[PDB]
Design a protein around this ligand. Structure first.
Ligand SMILES: NCc1ccc(C(F)(F)F)cc1
Length: 330
């Protein structure tokens, strides 16, 4: 079997991407943020604290003939940005673009932090990292991908994110019409539960490529590209007037600038991120200071190949017994 669903940016900056997911019987369609950096499928629901719901579509397990309470199970998660959510768990039928998993753990939110409440477009998250990161206690649960894997034609999913445009998540197959050239595959470490790999280097604009190992994760659930301070300083030093601002929380640059591209290595292959992908617009409405799409990973403890990097490529998340990541230009 296979699945194919369209993913759409939530706003004019590609702050996050939402993909429709059918849950329960009859179907309840929720727009979830597919996140390769976490492993919990959680939704806003009829159990979410009323004051923490602002325009989201909620899952109501009582209206689903296939919903079953996963007795005694709870979940609690905190993300890298400081956001968090927690609640209880149901099992129900979940379909993504025609691909169905029966008995999938659907984590119902009882509480969500302010960032989730304020994002009216995001009805929940669908985790796609390794199931070892799942927060369900006392019985850890599998991701939608882990549960579907044995039914898939190929044990893979692909992310093809758009730049200010819709894109696609495919499960179980590689769409050979969605990329140019060949897909370069690279080794993955599952030791920290992420799609963790090692980039072979970088170039800034038309500069010479620097061969250097950069360990990091392929994370669809992170907006920006977070790399070592040395790399990030080298990039921003090419933009007149750019600087790191502690009051803003990162590198900013004059909105009047035309940004250089950023190239990252995948083995002997190269993925070029166009300069326009690195512009996140004014820091505040009407400001002439713009926020950079390449930021330092210094306070994080891990480099993150977020949407800024992933949307420049067709990306294969290969969940075979030896997991790998594939990158192709498009
Ligand atoms: N990295 C996971 C994640 C996804 C979305 C959000 C936000 F912005 F919607 F709250 C925060 C964190």
């Amino acid at each position: 079997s296979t699945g194919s669903a369209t993913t759409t940016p939530i706003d004019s900056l590609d702050d996050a991407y939402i993909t429709p997911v059918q849950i329960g019987t009859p179907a309840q369609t929720l727009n979830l943020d597919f996140d390769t950096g976490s492993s919990d499928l959680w939704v806003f629901s009829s159990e979410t604290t009323a004051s923490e719901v602002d325009g989201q579509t909620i899952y109501t397990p009582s209206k689903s003939t296939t919903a079953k309470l996963l007795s005694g199970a709870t979940w609690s998660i905190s993300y890298g940005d400081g956001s968090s959510s927690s609640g209880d768990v149901y099992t129900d039928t979940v379909s993504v673009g025609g691909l169905t998993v029966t008995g999938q753990a659907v984590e119902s939110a009882k509480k969500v932090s302010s960032s989730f409440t304020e994002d009216s477009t995001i009805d929940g998250l669908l985790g796609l990292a390794f199931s070892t990161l799942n927060t369900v206690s006392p019985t850890q649960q599998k991701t939608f991908f882990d549960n579907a894997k044995a039914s898939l034609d190929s044990p893979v999913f692909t992310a093809d994110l758009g730049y200010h445009a819709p894109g696609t998540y495919n499960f179980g197959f590689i769409d050979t019409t969605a990329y140019t050239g060949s897909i370069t595959y690279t080794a993955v470490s599952t030791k920290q539960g992420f799609w963790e790999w090692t980039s072979t280097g970088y170039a800034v604009g038309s500069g010479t490529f620097k061969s250097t190992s950069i360990d990091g994760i392929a994370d669809t659930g992170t907006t920006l590209l977070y790399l070592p301070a040395t790399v990030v300083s080298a990039y921003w030093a090419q933009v007149s007037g750019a600087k790191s601002s502690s009051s803003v929380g990162g590198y900013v640059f004059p909105c009047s600038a035309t940004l250089p591209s950023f190239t990252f290595g995948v083995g002997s292959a190269r993925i070029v991120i166009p300069g326009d992908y690195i512009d996140f617009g004014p820091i505040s409405t009407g400001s002439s200071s713009c926020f950079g799409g390449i930021q330092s990973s210094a306070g994080i403890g891990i480099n993150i190949f977020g949407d800024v990097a992933l949307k420049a490529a067709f990306v294969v998340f290969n969940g075979a017994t030896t997991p790998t990541l594939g990158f192709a230009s498009k």
